Ligand binder design. Structure first.
Ligand SMILES: CC(C)Oc1ccccc1-c1c(C(N)=O)[nH]c2cc(F)c(Cl)cc12
Ligand SMILES: [Mn+2]
Ligand SMILES: [Mn+2]
Length: 366
């Protein structure tokens, strides 16, 4: 079976034996002393420990192949003039088909972020949003896929005006540096310092104005757990805990021509159940129904209001506010730097395998 144009064939139909293409395989970097961690590539004790978890790595790879094919399709049609809703719905329709959506066993890990200009993250349109992608916009496309809760958190920046080319180059280089410096036993603060050092070495000129590129200090990389986008460990992107064997990380960096700090701005669109809250009995009818719709369709994965609308849900705002006030669901509003500033992002998911570091979401694009 061969892939169609536009893509419509599920990834598990292109690889029916269940063996999915590997991502970029990398040798582990040497420790702070000077001694290499490379021995793992040939360690028979690590080879057995890596082959035992083959099913897990394989689930990540199916989700990363769906991610690669979706984003290549998006890059062929994403154009100024389209509404943000049209872009998100078209990407998500393709994503559901290629991942072969199946309740909580396979699907979309989180809503399609399409944050514009000074807004760096967590903007997706709610219904009625008339926002249109502009020729001069700097759009961060951040979407996720999953197979059995193995999440691919991977993102890129879209532009149509070549004036942002050096800002894009700075963020791509800083993300690639964070990826190279990652490895088993490496301290998280050292990955951050290396990212910042590369990012700040760039100066850019946009519309007659100049800036030294700044990392967004309150945004960061993070460990990923099963059905848990952020498993608790933080990979700073500026200058105590160490990366461990078997862990999975989202290595992301954000560069800004503003203050390099993000604040909560605009209306909220992204929501996600608190992973640590157990069962809470609810009598309020609309609130109880919405919590049941959330547990059924999303569980601990993130969602957006547009995804409640497509399920036939209506009059849920107060019920959603109640779940938020109770601490059962947390809101994740858009995170924006100062007005007039520009932000860019590049993100990859990496597997800290016993034998090698796998940049599972790597493609021929980024
Ligand atoms: C930047 C910060 C506010 O993000 C988080 C903080 C804690 C836990 C999770 C996330 C998060 C991330 C991510 N850290 O990459 N991506 C997300 C997609 C979503 F749809 C939602 Cl609701 C949540 C997340
Ligand atoms: Mn992301
Ligand atoms: Mn992330």
């Amino acid at each position: 079976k061969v892939q169609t144009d536009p893509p419509s064939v599920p990834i598990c139909d292109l690889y029916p034996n269940g063996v999915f293409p590997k991502g970029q395989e990398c040798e582990y970097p040497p420790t702070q002393d000077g001694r290499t961690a490379a021995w793992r590539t040939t360690s028979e004790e690590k080879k057995a420990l890596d082959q035992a978890s083959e099913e897990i790595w394989n689930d990540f790879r199916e989700a990363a192949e769906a991610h690669r094919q979706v984003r290549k399709y998006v890059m062929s049609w994403i154009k100024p003039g389209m509404t943000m809703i049209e872009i998100c719905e078209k990407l998500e329709d393709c994503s559901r088909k290629l991942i072969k959506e199946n309740g909580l066993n396979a699907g979309l890990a989180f809503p399609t972020g399409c944050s514009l200009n000074n807004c760096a993250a967590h903007y997706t349109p709610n219904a009625g949003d008339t926002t249109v992608l502009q020729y001069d916009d700097i759009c961060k496309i951040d979407f996720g896929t999953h197979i059995s809760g193995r999440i691919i958190d991977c993102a890129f920046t879209v532009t149509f005006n070549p004036k942002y080319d050096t800002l894009l180059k700075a963020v791509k280089d800083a993300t690639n540096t964070g990826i190279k410096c990652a490895g088993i036993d490496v301290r998280l603060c050292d990955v951050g310092e290396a990212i910042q050092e590369v990012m700040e070495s760039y100066e850019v000129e946009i519309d007659g104005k100049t800036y030294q590129v700044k990392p967004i200090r309150n945004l960061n990389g993070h460990s990923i757990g099963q059905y848990r986008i952020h498993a608790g460990k933080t990979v700073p992107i500026v200058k105590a805990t160490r990366m461990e064997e078997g862990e999975v990380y989202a290595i992301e960096t954000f560069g800004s021509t503003g203050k390099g700090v993000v604040h909560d701005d605009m209306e909220c669109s992204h929501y996600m159940k608190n992973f640590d809250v157990g069962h809470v009995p609810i009598r309020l009818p609309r609130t109880k129904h919405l919590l049941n719709v959330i547990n059924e369709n999303f569980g601990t994965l993130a969602f957006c209001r547009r995804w409640l609308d497509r399920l036939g849900e209506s009059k849920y705002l107060m019920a959603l506010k109640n779940l938020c006030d109770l601490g059962i669901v947390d809101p994740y509003p858009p995170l924006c730097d100062i007005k007039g500033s520009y932000t860019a992002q590049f993100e990859h998911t990496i597997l800290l395998r016993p034998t090698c570091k796998e940049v599972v979401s790597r493609g021929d694009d980024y």
